[PDB]
Amino acid sequence: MFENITAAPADPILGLADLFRADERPGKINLGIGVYKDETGKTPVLTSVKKAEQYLLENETTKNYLGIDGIPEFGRCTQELLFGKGSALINDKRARTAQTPGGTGALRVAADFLAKNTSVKRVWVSNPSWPNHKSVFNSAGLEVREYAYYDAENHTLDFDALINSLNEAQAGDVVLFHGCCHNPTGIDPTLEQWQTLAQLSVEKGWLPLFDFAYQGFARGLEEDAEGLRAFAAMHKELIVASSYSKNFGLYNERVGACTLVAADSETVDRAFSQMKAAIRANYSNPPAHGASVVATILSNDALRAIWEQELTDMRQRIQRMRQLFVNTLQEKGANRDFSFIIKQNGMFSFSGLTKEQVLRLREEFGVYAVASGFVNVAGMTPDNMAPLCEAIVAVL
Amino acid sequence: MFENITAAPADPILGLADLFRADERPGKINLGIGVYKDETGKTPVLTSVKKAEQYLLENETTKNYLGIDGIPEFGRCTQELLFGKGSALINDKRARTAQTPGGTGALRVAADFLAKNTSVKRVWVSNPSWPNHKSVFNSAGLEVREYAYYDAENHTLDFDALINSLNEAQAGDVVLFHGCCHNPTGIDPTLEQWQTLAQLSVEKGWLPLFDFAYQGFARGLEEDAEGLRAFAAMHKELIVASSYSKNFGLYNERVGACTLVAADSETVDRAFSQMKAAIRANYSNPPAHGASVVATILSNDALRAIWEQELTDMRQRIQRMRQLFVNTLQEKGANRDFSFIIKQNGMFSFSGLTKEQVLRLREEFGVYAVASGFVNVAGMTPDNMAPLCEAIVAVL
């Protein structure tokens, strides 16, 4: 059966980490890591999370199966983080949430479920979008198309090209958005923008699906949701996929969730059942541990408070490198403008650099950057900034 | 989009636990639980697991993403538990293992991967088989057919009907087996039986896929694998799906794994890549926590030793109820033979009882049993045995 021909031509992971895992001089990391790193290059484990990890060592009584949808507390908790405080979408019971081996879990689960119950044929992702997007959905047998976004050149969102690319879409078509700023270039629709996508989105069909990892990394836990929230001001039907993998620095635990909305609660229920349908058919129920950490930090408001400050730290270091990058680059000699990298959000941004600068940087240079010129601001530490910036400007 | 018609007609879970969750007199549990219970009706959390849970509170340095295949230690460790000690299938590097949100995760992942790379069209499950089997594979677009097994009446494996039902199968068809004794009736092929399935299996085509949750519950960690192992003595190509969900009482953590075999290591590799392919496309990498517990107990041989004794306990309580069931039933008045329930293995066995005894037991009786007459020996405690056995014999 497996004997003769298969093999991968694979993901931009070992597509950079393994040459890094060998191409040893004093390698300026990959800026092609997918995780955050602190001022020392470590991707710590959090005080809010540990303290919470301990609350579980002691309080757990059984490792008894979780409900298909998971931890309801996590539920309440996730819902309220995405839609708000007195959110009339919560009291009103239009939203239902599933706990999933998070982020990708949710987009998958979202995928498999749309694929029946629904007659969604295509998914519109965005050029570029997080690399693993296409695979999730092709896997489920939905065809993926791309809308414009960052035509680049002038480093911002070619708003017009988007709207323009989008009109090709249609009524029962799902349009994938990243709530708060986009992997790989933290370029944001401003509220207005977010606002018109929504006006357009209702008058044309489009079930909107939010891909939401990164909340609290652009401006703040609650502002980051505004995009999700205005859409949500006017949808009836909407679906969002979340991850506490980045915001809780819980990467390996696999935490995130899938929220589904319907006009009303009866409808929400006939459909959530069918999303649970798709869950018993994937993995029968989600992994507790991560989410309990999660459910526990969001409930304990002392632990929340301590948790909100770490994230603040995160997000802040990230902001500090973005200026420093542009600064160390001034001083050292660059023929260009990159004042565009302090304008973007998140870990990611494309360093406007060529497939070949990117490659002239891994020879007698040593910096790892995935071929697309995309760097992870998070891998830049205050001291590695010197050499990095020598190297970047020694190619332009 | 979701508006009008969907809804579930669902899993034998709330299909029994929810009426239990309400039908309150002194309800004799459901014997329609899917988890083990101790002599008090609790599904504890283990000393081996806690001690290990603590080793992690203190030793974890980052929550950094796991490899797609997961924890390699878990790897080594799982492989050696399934195939053995000096296993020439390990040194020989024909086996490769993926860590997955376990058990169902693995059958799914196994499913999605067969579905391309391979030209497996059908899956042969067994009548009955674990209820969630059909959904996993239909979900992936493989058609499921059933082979005979327990025609019942004479409570044992209609060996002949199996062989007989099987011949309809064919060359690139996957045949699903439960390594050590079967959910819902712990009826075993003896080594010989296991042995002929294998002889047959090579001479006819059939990629064999083992569904293996329950190891150490029939006779012992190592004997339970004999079935897996003799097949494995002669396959080249074979695939097994595991779960430490029952044996480690880790139910909610989601621990298990998918082992794939090929004739040789080159071939194993072109295909594992494509199984990792299917993994980045499901959830991008598995949840650490559970498996670290797992990887940690199997390496630390003090913790292993302590772990092997709990399981022994488990398996033993399970054996003690099976005799007690048959005994309390003698004494109290039954018109039948049920000496067949001390012959079976595992938590499960069908109490030869009718859809209507099953139902005459939930009226002014109070015992919950999924309509198929299947009981979970594990929910029977030494004291609830009195009333249960009054009730069972008061209907025959």
Ligand SMILES: *Cc1c(COP(=O)(O)O)cnc(C)c1O
């Ligand atoms: C980081 C990220 C994810 C993460 O999915 P998880 O399994 O939560 O790691 C998903 N989508 C996007 C756009 C991301 O940036």
Ligand SMILES: *Cc1c(COP(=O)(O)O)cnc(C)c1O
């Ligand atoms: C219990 C059981 C499973 C469990 O899958 P998990 O997700 O590990 O709970 C799978 N298959 C069979 C036959 C089982 O009995």
